Amino acid sequence: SSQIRQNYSTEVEAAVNRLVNLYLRASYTYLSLGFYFDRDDVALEGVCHFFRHLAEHKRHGAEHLLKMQNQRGGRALFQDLQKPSQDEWGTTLDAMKAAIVLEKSLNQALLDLHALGSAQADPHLCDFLESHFLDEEVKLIKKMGDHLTNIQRLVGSQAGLGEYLFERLTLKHD
Amino acid sequence: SSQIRQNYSTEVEAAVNRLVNLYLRASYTYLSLGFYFDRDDVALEGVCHFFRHLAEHKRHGAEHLLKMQNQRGGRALFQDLQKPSQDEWGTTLDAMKAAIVLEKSLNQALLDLHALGSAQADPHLCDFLESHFLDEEVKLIKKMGDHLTNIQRLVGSQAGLGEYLFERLTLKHD
Amino acid sequence: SSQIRQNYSTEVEAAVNRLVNLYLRASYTYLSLGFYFDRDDVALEGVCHFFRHLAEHKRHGAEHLLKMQNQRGGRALFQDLQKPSQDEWGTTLDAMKAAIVLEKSLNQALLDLHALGSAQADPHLCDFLESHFLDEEVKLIKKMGDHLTNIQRLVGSQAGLGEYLFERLTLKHD
Amino acid sequence: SSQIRQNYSTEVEAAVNRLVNLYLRASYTYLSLGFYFDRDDVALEGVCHFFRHLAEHKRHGAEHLLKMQNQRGGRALFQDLQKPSQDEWGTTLDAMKAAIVLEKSLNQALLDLHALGSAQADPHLCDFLESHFLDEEVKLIKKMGDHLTNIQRLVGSQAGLGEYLFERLTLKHD
Amino acid sequence: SSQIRQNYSTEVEAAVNRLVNLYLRASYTYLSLGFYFDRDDVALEGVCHFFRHLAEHKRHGAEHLLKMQNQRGGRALFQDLQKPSQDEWGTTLDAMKAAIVLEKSLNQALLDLHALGSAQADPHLCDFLESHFLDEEVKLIKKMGDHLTNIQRLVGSQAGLGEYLFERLTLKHD
Amino acid sequence: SSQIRQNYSTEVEAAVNRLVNLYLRASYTYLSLGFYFDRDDVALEGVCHFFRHLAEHKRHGAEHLLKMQNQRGGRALFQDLQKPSQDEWGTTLDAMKAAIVLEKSLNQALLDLHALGSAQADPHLCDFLESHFLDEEVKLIKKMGDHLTNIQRLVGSQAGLGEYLFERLTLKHD
Ligand SMILES: [Cl-]
Ligand SMILES: [Cl-]
Ligand SMILES: [Cl-]
Ligand SMILES: [Cl-]
Ligand SMILES: [Cl-]
Ligand SMILES: [Cl-]
């Protein structure tokens, strides 16, 4: 048996491995979204940058989970990573709606794992999620909702103008 | 005969002289495009700057070819430079479409010369084009395609507004 | 059709997408190797660091390929990422042998794509691989071979001592 | 009609366009002279540099004229640029004599345009030429005459020695 | 067999060893040329320095080839180094003509090896030569041709004067 | 006859040329030893560095002898350089034993030349060897003997472990 493992259930260990897969899937989704907005026939640099930075953040979250798995004496187990849900992501609005759906899914997985840790009286797990992930997720979802509202306000009768303006004046670009 | 010339065919020497003429023609075209956008009745400073900088880059490319011609022991031969294809260049969209056409023509001339150098087993020529020109061209054409997409998105029902916004918010200006 | 695409075959476009998948698979493999060596019952920090840094490099290589795909006017297409070949990676020697096998596979894929680009007279593709990947791969494989030789020399009759010493005295650690 | 044009005759507008062509022709001539002196079988670096710098100055003069054309509300009109008068330029002495002939031609065109502006009571045009071009031209022709005298003094009975010495000891080189 | 070797033919391996011998022979030739011009009865410091620096560069080129041999998993094999072709090298003109002959021989060996690598579909070898050697060689041969032209111009009827002047005013010295 | 030569015998002149050949042979030997230890199947970086630095030092010694030859008014005469005695150099111990043998041979040649200079009452030659070479040689041989002793101490029953440790903990490496 493990020389360090203490108060770390098999159920939590397994759910951590699943959450790693979810974060890596999210990272891959955001890589796809980022390169879609870099297409010459899409060409929204700020949208590309927004999603490339999220891909990086989600990968980091998976790495933090993996580090924690080892700190607790669990065993990292990797599974196939499913390809993102779409090959082409539509408008900035379509993309930002898909991103909010994805984030709510991740957030629910975090909440589910927190509730499992609570039930198993695993306060280190619960603290870990609170300190690394729960507020980051709430902040990110709020940011996406803010963006969605601004995107929606800009559609008007001139969708192309609005999509350009949002990319130029809200999102970070060179 | 030449004291330095080695593995440098008459066919390549001639094609290099032709490519010099093509780059100088492109430079002249961009000088014309730049000063058109500086007209008081056109007045798109960022568009002017974009094309003036390209004129400079294309002249530099011709100069690099001429330097290489001499390094190989070929003889620079200059021909008449034909005037650009238009005196007035229309909208920013018209201009950017003309520029992409021009660049694809230049790119094809580069590819043709590379294929000639390959056939003639002239690796110095092939390397020269790879290192100085092929990626620069691919990057420039990608940039132009990006610009075209943004310009097209902005036409909407309000072409003047969109042309102003693109010049103000995408292109570099004072 | 694409507004920028020029001299870029469907065969190359597809092979680039496949190569992206191979680099991302390699990255995932190295993530797994890195976290295996971070296990409390393995505990070889320098080995962990070696493979975590390779995971990062391979992801960057995939990103460069994706950037190039878009520069050429091809379309990025992502596929499922298969999980690494093992869940537990044995000794440092076992791991370094698996890594050399993986790298030779990647190198062969690079060479195959280069030969396709040559056959298709696609010098931008060929240059791209030469400049970004071929020498990096040769250097990495040489480094791994160097490491394998030192690891093998150290097995002697005292395998644990040798594995410790290699991690402490060859690999970078805190 | 033009919203800004005032006191700017069609005759002046046309003569400015012609003068632009003359300056660009002169620039092209100097590009040819510069690369001739860079030939491995000519190899006079200081002579090459002298003429390359003049090519740049003449292009700048054309650009200043074009800027002025637009400031006045005239319309830039480009014509074919004729190739330089020679493919091979002889000795430094031959070249410097050709350059003085070229500059006197340019100077006469400046004087002719100034006289037209005077006759048309166009003081902005006259000032423009005075401030940008007339003294620059007189200074350049004086410099060329100085150089010609030194070159001629050096021919003696040892032309090669003298041509080397002039390039080494009068002209700027690395 | 070799643990790292991949796509590296025995023909290329052998030709690399031969090219190493050629570069080391060239280095030795230039060492001899350098010390000849340091003789008290020759005494042309700038000529000495020119050839001593080339000796160093050629040795470095051999070392780069040897490094590459090992990176590819080939085996360095050294042969006897033949002494230079002359014990006394005549005038600066004689020496510079011998150097251009030597460099054209080296250049042809580079081109031959590049063609072998092309035929063997060895793009790493081809890139290596392109990036390290082909342009360096073209630049060096151009420099030598430039020097030869200036030396020849200076012979006139006063060979000693011209040889002094070239050494003092073209070549780098203390 | 020579304008500067004074008290410099033909016997010394010839022996200096021979000593130059010996130093260049030693340099070549050390180049071979250095690249052997850089093989992926040998992979002892510190051993490689040790011998590459000696190759450089021995070449410098030959150059100092050549400089002195010219200072005295003798004539440098180069001979064929024989290839090193082995293609593969065995273990670090084998290599260090071969190096000590080589250095003792060089040292004896120095002593022989010193004795010739003494017999010929050539104090400049004797001083030259004393100041540039004799103590450098004694110091180098002492260093090699120190290394041999440490290498021998480390063979024990675990030769690979000892060879690794010596390279890591005695020799300079990155
Ligand atoms: Cl799926
Ligand atoms: Cl025309
Ligand atoms: Cl699988
Ligand atoms: Cl004409
Ligand atoms: Cl011989
Ligand atoms: Cl031998």
Show the 3-state SS of A16-73. Answer: HHHHHHHHHHHHHHHHHHHHHHCCCCCCCHHHHHHHHHHHHHHHHHHHHHHHHHHHHC
Residues of B in contact with C123 (CB under 8 A): 111, 114, 118, 126, 129-130, 134
Instruction: Kindly determine whether residue C111 and residue E7, on different chains, have CB atoms separated by under 8 Å.
Output: yes
D touches F, CB cut-off 8 Å, minimum 3 pairs: no
Buried b (16+ CB within 10 A) or exposed e, B60-72: ebbbebbebbbbb
Instruction: Kindly determine whether residue D38 and residue B3, on different chains, have CB atoms separated by under 8 Å.
Output: no
Check if A81 contacts C (Cβ < 8 Å): yes
Long-range contacts of C85-89 (CB under 8 A, 24+ apart): C85/C29, C86/C32, C87/A75, C87/A77, C87/A78, C87/C32, C88/C36, C89/C32, C89/C33, C89/C36, C89/C37
Question: Tokens standing for A52?
Answer: 């490339």
What is the rounded CA–CA span in Å between residue D54 and residue D60? 10
Check if C150 contacts F (Cβ < 8 Å): yes
Cα(F84) to centroid(ligand 6), Å: 7
DSSP conformational letter for C81: B
Check if F33 contacts E (Cβ < 8 Å): no
Q: Are C104 and E6 within 8 A, CB to CB?
A: yes
Reference B72, options D123, A107, D39, D70; nearest CA is D39
Q: Are C114 and C129 within 8 A, CB to CB?
A: yes
Is the backbone of residue F7 left (phi > 0), alpha (psi -120 to 50) or beta? left
- If DSSP codes are grouped into helix, strand and coil, which group holds residue E44? coil
Check if F119 contacts C (Cβ < 8 Å): no
Check if D129 contacts E (Cβ < 8 Å): no
Which of D38, D40, D70 is nearest residue B35 as measured by Cβ atoms? D70
Question: Tokens standing for E67?
Answer: 């490094």
Query: Which residue of F lies nearest to C161 if distances are taken between CA atoms?
Result: F161
Residues of D in contact with B41 (CB under 8 A): 2-3
What is the rounded CA–CA span in Å between residue F145 and residue E35? 35
Question: Tokens standing for D126?
Answer: 């006259």
Question: Tokens standing for E77?
Answer: 């094999």
Q: Are E58 and E30 within 8 A, CB to CB?
A: yes
Residue A86: how many CB atoms within 10 A of its CB?
A: 15
Q: Are E33 and C171 within 8 A, CB to CB?
A: no
> What are the two backbone dihedrals, phi and then psi, of residue A81, each rounded to the nearest 5 degrees?
-100, 120
Reference B102, options B18, B20, B30, B172; nearest CA is B30
Q: Are D47 and D171 within 8 A, CB to CB?
A: yes
Rounded to the nearest angstrom, the gap between the alpha carbon of residue D69 and the centroid of all alpha carbons in its chain is 19
Residue with tokens 């390397």: B127
Instruction: Kindly determine whether residue E4 and residue C108, on different chains, have CB atoms separated by under 8 Å.
Output: no
Residue with tokens 């590379």: B114
What is the rounded CA–CA span in Å between residue C49 and residue A61? 18
Cα(B37) to centroid(ligand 2), Å: 21
Angle at A170 between CA A165 and CA A174, to 5 degrees: 90
Which bound ligand lies closest to the C-alpha atom of E84?
A: 5
Residues of C in contact with A35 (CB under 8 A): 66-67, 69-70, 76
Instruction: Kindly determine whether residue A73 and residue C38, on different chains, have CB atoms separated by under 8 Å.
Output: no
What is the rounded CA–CA span in Å between residue B29 and residue B33? 6
Question: Tokens standing for A69?
Answer: 């798995």
What is the rounded CA–CA span in Å between residue C152 and residue C160? 12
Distance of residue B154 Cα from the nearest chain A Cα, in angstroms: 5
Check if F174 contacts E (Cβ < 8 Å): no
Buried b (16+ CB within 10 A) or exposed e, D69-108: bbebbbbbbbeebebbeeeebebbbebbbbbbebbeebbe
Cα(B23) to centroid(ligand 2), Å: 15
Preferred mutation among C149, C155, C165, C167 to probe F, highest tally of F CBs within 10 A: C149
Got the DSSP string for B27-86?
HHHHHHHHHHHTSTTT--HHHHHHHHHHHHHHHHHHHHHHHHHHHHT------PBPPPS-
Which bound ligand lies closest to the C-alpha atom of D80?
A: 2
Rounded to the nearest angstrom, the gap between the alpha carbon of residue B105 and the centroid of all alpha carbons in its chain is 9
What is the rounded CA–CA span in Å between residue F91 and residue F41? 12
Helix (H) or strand (E) holding A4: none
Taking CA atoms, A44 is separated from A91, A170, B84, in Å, by 10, 12, 32
Question: Tokens standing for D91?
Answer: 């000795």
Check if C119 contacts B (Cβ < 8 Å): no
* Bridge partners, B69 (sequence order): none
CB-based contacts of B160, cutoff 8 Å, min separation 6: none
Question: Tokens standing for A137?
Answer: 């997720």
Check if A87 contacts B (Cβ < 8 Å): no
Subunits that touch chain D (at least 3 Cβ pairs < 8 angstroms)?
A: B, E
By what technique were these coordinates determined?
Answer: X-ray
- If DSSP codes are grouped into helix, strand and coil, which group holds residue F13? helix
Question: Tokens standing for F25?
Answer: 């042979």
What is the rounded CA–CA span in Å between residue D52 and residue D167? 15
DSSP conformational letter for C79: -
Question: Tokens standing for B120?
Answer: 């003639």
Helix (H) or strand (E) holding A129: helix A123-129
What is the rounded CA–CA span in Å between residue E46 and residue D109? 49
Rounded to the nearest angstrom, the gap between the alpha carbon of residue C52 and the centroid of all alpha carbons in its chain is 11
Reference B78, options B134, B124, B16, B30; nearest CA is B16
Check if F80 contacts E (Cβ < 8 Å): yes
Angle at E43 between CA E39 and CA E46, to 5 degrees: 115
Handedness of CA B151, B154, B160, B165 (dihedral sign): negative
Question: Tokens standing for A22?
Answer: 């979810």
Query: Which residue of C lies nearest to B119 if distances are taken between CA atoms?
Result: C121
- If DSSP codes are grouped into helix, strand and coil, which group holds residue A10? helix
Cα(A84) to centroid(ligand 1), Å: 7
Residue E106: how many CB atoms within 10 A of its CB?
A: 20
Taking CA atoms, E161 is separated from A113, E47, E85, E141, in Å, by 91, 15, 28, 25
Instruction: Kindly determine whether residue B121 and residue E138, on different chains, have CB atoms separated by under 8 Å.
Output: no
Which bound ligand lies closest to the C-alpha atom of D28?
A: 4
Check if F35 contacts C (Cβ < 8 Å): no
